[PDB]
């Protein structure tokens, strides 16, 4: 099943879509600068692009740690991004009450992995009618993803993306099961599956650029709707060379018939 | 470090406290009936007991599963439980705005495992000044619990309980690391540690729950936590082992 | 099912048996000294005891690392141990051809965890007719132990002990699933199950840790405990025996 | 570091080499027929190919399941494969005593995963001077492979291949950590790394084997290790077309600096 996001077709047999941007919104000017770099790189390579950022860091290490611009200012920044670049955007939501005002502006709304079983958040997200990105928790198996999908379907929204971010592997470590992508496709109605390579790696001794590339290449080899990543996270200047490689592999894989 | 909860002393060197009740509050009459059974069994054995229920469950198996009676009626029910039986009570909260009004009534407030890193909720819970039960997520290592504890401390509350519920073990299965109890004690200032045996098992039976409860309580724990006369036979065995363990001094040096 | 090892009764409802000793045999004098200490401690506490050692270290970090005394000399030392102390002994075997000469001397022969799927070794061990200790590999689940047991039964030997040593948990770490003991008892005809606490901890082995883990496992009702280790052994065994006596005095439910 | 195996170059920046064949040698005629099919398909696609089988399977489902034809007859069959097709062959050894007679005939000898820490076998294999395939145990982390390599190096043999077969993931399940390939290359001197997709999948089908094989080969590997009967033997060509496409793309691009 494909999902249309403005003029973008997202699907497991379509050219991969990049979901990329930054961890947290800090200011309008920095955001526009970072976004302009993603837009020019992706446009030249012919890769469909959706700009990603959080307006709030909800689970920071300290109560005193900087958390970002917040809802009202964050939505102002997203409105400016869409106006300036004409691209879709994606952000996460952590409270039911935020879903409607966020969905008015943001094309895709994201369910945080830690909140995937917050049933009132699922319902509030579903009711927006927006495209939803479901972050697969590290503690949930790929065959249990269908239970989250079921909830969104019972609540009347079928425009769902499934986002791999790795699986718990002993203490404080993650592994990405390359077979989990296929399990999700087979058991969740072939909804678009995307791969968050960045968060999949957060527990490895260097977020290495070579590591991220090997892991991204491996996952895309399984035939995926998209790649989800952050830069500052990959350094922003290496983005073009990274994406050249991803696109070469995706174009190859997508050109071969399924069987 | 011990925590006093009315007349109960909760601590890793104290007789174990049982936390148990029902999943979701439905009515005063049904609640009182179930609570009266736990109270009668625990009184008969002399085991300190704290009644547990949810008034508004946000993590339900289905989206239209009953959440519970809700805040206003749930707190009325909890008041009546406390008045009738003279025991403390425990409930979970998932919205920051609920923490204050809940804490007026409920002796212990519980942080759901899935929300354990949600800073706004941790702060709102801390600020109640109530005793807080911190449910350990299945994805978190025992040495990371200190970071949650640190956030509660920054927010001004040190009356914290750590609740083990198992760890992710490949797909679906949970395993309980019996060494994790000691790691939490060592790194978190010897706060009371309790063992939620039920959740630890839902991914795997009475004989199982008994082996696993006994193994955990052998490590010297403040309490045992159950989720949704067999209860009596079970508690007799747990109390035997607890009484033996707690009567012996901790290992020399 | 119980197993008789000379005058010792080994079984999951019998007083626990300690299997202990040293890693690798280095000399007669140092072996007799270590064995005498275990004997003195176990005798004064009233705990049945089987002396353990390897005659060959088959996994050395270096090709030039010292291997131990080897078969011929090792069996001489075991014969001296049995003669001086009148106790049973246990050793591992890594090659089929070693099984018969080792079994002439050693009461219990042990199948190393890495070799548990070496079918020719299983057969050669079974054909000795000796009591066998089957080390559960860290990569095998408890419900797969019945397949190893089946092989020994087909080869004509039912005097089998199942020995827990933990399960692989991420990279370079182990966890012990306390539910795995009950699985093995239920699926393998209630053969004696013992717990190797020492090898279960290789990857973490503090004294307080070893004690918590040993207590937790023995709380599930086991035939024995298997270890390599100011009076640490006696302090440890006093606690284990207290718990084992309590658990074994309660009827199975 | 590359390894030459007769006229084949094996290395992490060379075209992938296929190691394939069957589980246990059972008969000469059937072995030759199977091998002929691998040969014809791989020659057609220009893929370097090494025929694999066990002559003495030591880890059997039952004690009386057939172990295979045994050493003497198994080596005769391997000699016939080499003579008829002019390709290298690979087999496993489980006992120190078997290392010499197997190494005299077989171009690669293989260290079974479960025996990977058995020092006497490692020494005996090393001393043959033969190319060695080291199967990574499911319980060993990728940064511990260097310790096995070290033992071979101490014993005088550096012609070593590292073979991924997955990692224990909870009970009875395996996961392949796609980052482990790079850890092995970085810590073990960039020895050839190959991927046993067949044994990596025991615990879970054709679509799965393909996804997993493609993912692994995307990380830039010296080879792919598989069995057929296990993959069905007639789908081999379609499978290898896909593997070869991806491998040719990857290998044609310079390593990222
Ligand atoms: Cl994110
Ligand atoms: Cl093989
Ligand atoms: Cl059999
Ligand atoms: Na050779």
Burial class (CB in 10 A: 0-12, 13-18, 19+), C69: buried
Which residue reads 């479901």 in tokens? A134
How far does the CA of residue A255 sit from the closest CA of chain D (Å)?
A: 11
B230 at C interface, C-beta within 8 A: no
How far does the CA of residue A7 sit from the closest CA of chain B (Å)?
A: 33
Task: For CA atoms D235, D237, D239, D240, give the dihedral sign.
Answer: positive
Give the separation between CA B201 and CA B226, rounded to whole angstroms: 11
Give the separation between CA D228 and CA D235, rounded to whole angstroms: 10
Give the separation between CA A172 and CA D192, rounded to whole angstroms: 30
Q: How many domains does chain D have?
A: 1
Give the Å distance between the CA of A238 and the centre of ligand 1: 20
Give the Å distance between the CA of D151 and the centre of ligand 4: 20
DSSP A48-79: -EEEEEES--TT-SSTTS---S-HHHHHHHHH
Question: Does residue C162 contact residue C145 with C-beta atoms inside 8 Å?
Answer: yes
CB neighbour list of residue D86: distance below 8 Å, 6 or more residues apart: none
List the shell of residues around ion ligand 4, using CB closer than 5 Å.
Answer: D 103, 130
Which residue reads 């449910």 in tokens? B135
Ligand showing the shortest atom-to-Cα distance for residue D58: 2
- Using CB atoms, which residue from C60, C117, C142 is nearest to D119? C60
Question: Does residue D176 contact residue D166 with C-beta atoms inside 8 Å?
Answer: yes
Nearest CA in chain D to B167: D170
Q: Do C59 and D139 touch (CB under 8 A)?
A: no
Ligand showing the shortest atom-to-Cα distance for residue D129: 4
Give the separation between CA A100 and CA B191, rounded to whole angstroms: 41
How far does the CA of residue D89 sit from the closest CA of chain A (Å)?
A: 29
Give the separation between CA D227 and CA D213, rounded to whole angstroms: 13
Q: Is C117 helix (H, G, I), strand (E, B) or coil?
A: coil
Question: Does residue B32 contact residue B22 with C-beta atoms inside 8 Å?
Answer: no
Which two structure tokens, joined as six digits, stand for C138? 């860290």
* CA distances, D41 to each of D18, D44, D108, D211 (Å): 11, 5, 22, 21
Question: Does residue A31 contact residue A22 with C-beta atoms inside 8 Å?
Answer: yes
Q: Is C23 helix (H, G, I), strand (E, B) or coil?
A: strand
Identify which of C175, C109, C111 has the alpha carbon closest to the alpha carbon of residue C138. C175
Question: Does residue A82 contact residue A88 with C-beta atoms inside 8 Å?
Answer: yes
Rg from Cα positions in chain A: 17
CA angle C15, C16, C17 (to 5 degrees): 120
C211 contacts on B by Cβ (under 8 Å): 251
How far does the CA of residue A14 sit from the closest CA of chain D (Å)?
A: 17
Which two structure tokens, joined as six digits, stand for A158? 């079928």
Identify which of A115, A62, A164, A125 has the alpha carbon closest to the alpha carbon of residue B137. A115
How far does the CA of residue B94 sit from the closest CA of chain A (Å)?
A: 9
D204 at B interface, C-beta within 8 A: no
Give the Å distance between the CA of B213 and the centre of ligand 3: 36
Give the separation between CA B144 and CA D81, rounded to whole angstroms: 58
* CA distances, B185 to each of B137, B139, B180, B190 (Å): 17, 19, 9, 4
Q: Is D78 helix (H, G, I), strand (E, B) or coil?
A: helix
Partners for C (CB, 8 Å, 3+ pairs)? A, B, D
Identify which of A207, A210, A218 has the alpha carbon closest to the alpha carbon of residue A249. A218
D62 at C interface, C-beta within 8 A: yes
Give the separation between CA B28 and CA B19, rounded to whole angstroms: 19
Burial class (CB in 10 A: 0-12, 13-18, 19+), B33: exposed
Give the separation between CA A174 and CA A167, rounded to whole angstroms: 5
B172 contacts on D by Cβ (under 8 Å): 170
Helix (H) or strand (E) holding D101: helix D99-103
Which two structure tokens, joined as six digits, stand for C36? 């005498």
A171 contacts on D by Cβ (under 8 Å): none
Give the Å distance between the CA of D95 and the centre of ligand 3: 22
CB neighbour list of residue C210: distance below 8 Å, 6 or more residues apart: C197, C198, C201, C227, C236
Helix (H) or strand (E) holding A196: strand A193-196
**Cα first-last separation, chain B:** 19
Task: Give the residue numbers spanning the domain of D107.
Answer: 1-257
Q: Do D138 and C139 touch (CB under 8 A)?
A: yes
What is the DSSP secondary structure assignment for residue A178, as one 8-state letter? Answer: T
A 10 A CB-CB count for B229 gives 10
Nearest CA in chain D to B168: D170
CB neighbour list of residue B127: distance below 8 Å, 6 or more residues apart: B99, B100, B155, B156, B157
Which two structure tokens, joined as six digits, stand for B198? 């039920």
Identify which of C203, C206, C113 has the alpha carbon closest to the alpha carbon of residue C165. C113
How far does the CA of residue C243 sit from the closest CA of chain A (Å)?
A: 30
Q: Which residue stretches of A178-238 are H helix? A: 180-187, 197-200, 209-220
Rounded to 10 degrees, the C-alpha dihedral D176/D179/D181/D185 comes to -160
Ligand showing the shortest atom-to-Cα distance for residue D163: 2
Q: After which residues is chain A broken (C to N over 2.5 A)?
A: 206, 232
Nearest CA in chain C to A173: C170
Task: For CA atoms C115, C118, C121, C125, give the dihedral sign.
Answer: positive
Which two structure tokens, joined as six digits, stand for B178? 């019996």
Give the Å distance between the CA of A200 and the centre of ligand 1: 11
Residues 155-194 of chain B with CB under 8 A from chain D are 169-173
CB neighbour list of residue D58: distance below 8 Å, 6 or more residues apart: C118, C119, C120, D67, D94, D112
Burial class (CB in 10 A: 0-12, 13-18, 19+), A100: middle
Q: How was this structure determined?
A: X-ray
CATH of the domain at D130: 3.20.20.70
Question: Does residue A49 contact residue A259 with C-beta atoms inside 8 Å?
Answer: no
A 10 A CB-CB count for C63 gives 17
Q: Is C226 helix (H, G, I), strand (E, B) or coil?
A: strand
Resolution of the experimental structure, in angstroms: 1.8
Which two structure tokens, joined as six digits, stand for D136? 């990574």
Partners for A (CB, 8 Å, 3+ pairs)? B, C, D
Rounded to 10 degrees, the C-alpha dihedral C36/C39/C45/C49 comes to 160
A 10 A CB-CB count for C144 gives 18
């Amino acid at each position: 099943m494909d999902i249309k996001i403005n003029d973008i077709t997202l699907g497991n047999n379509s050219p991969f879509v990049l979901f990329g941007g930054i961890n947290v919104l800090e200011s309008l000017d920095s955001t526009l600068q970072t976004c302009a770099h993603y837009v020019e790189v992706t446009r030249k390579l012919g890769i469909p692009y959706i700009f990603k950022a959080s307006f709030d860091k909800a689970n920071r290490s300290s109560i005193h740690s900087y958390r970002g611009v917040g809802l009202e200012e964050g939505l102002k920044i997203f409105e400016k991004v869409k106006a300036e670049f004409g691209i879709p955007v994606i952000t996460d939501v952590h409270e039911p009450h935020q879903c409607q005002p966020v969905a008015e502006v943001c094309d895709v709304i994201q369910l945080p992995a830690f909140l995937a079983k917050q049933t009132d958040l699922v319902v509030a997200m579903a009711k927006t009618g927006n495209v939803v990105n479901i972050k697969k928790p590290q503690f949930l198996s790929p065959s249990q993803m269908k239970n989250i999908v079921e909830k969104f379907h019972e609540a009347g929204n079928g425009k769902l993306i499934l986002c791999e971010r790795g699986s718990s592997f002993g203490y404080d470590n993650l592994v990405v099961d390359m077979l989990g992508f296929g399990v999700m496709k087979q058991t969740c109605g072939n909804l678009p599956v995307i791969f968050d390579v960045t968060h999949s790696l957060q527990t490895r001794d260097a977020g290495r650029r070579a590591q991220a590339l090997d892991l991204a290449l491996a996952g895309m080899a399984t035939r995926l709707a998209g790649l989800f990543l952050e830069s500052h996270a990959l350094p922003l200047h290496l983005l073009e060379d990274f994406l050249i490689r991803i696109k070469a592999l995706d174009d190859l894989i997508k050109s071969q018939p399924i069987l």
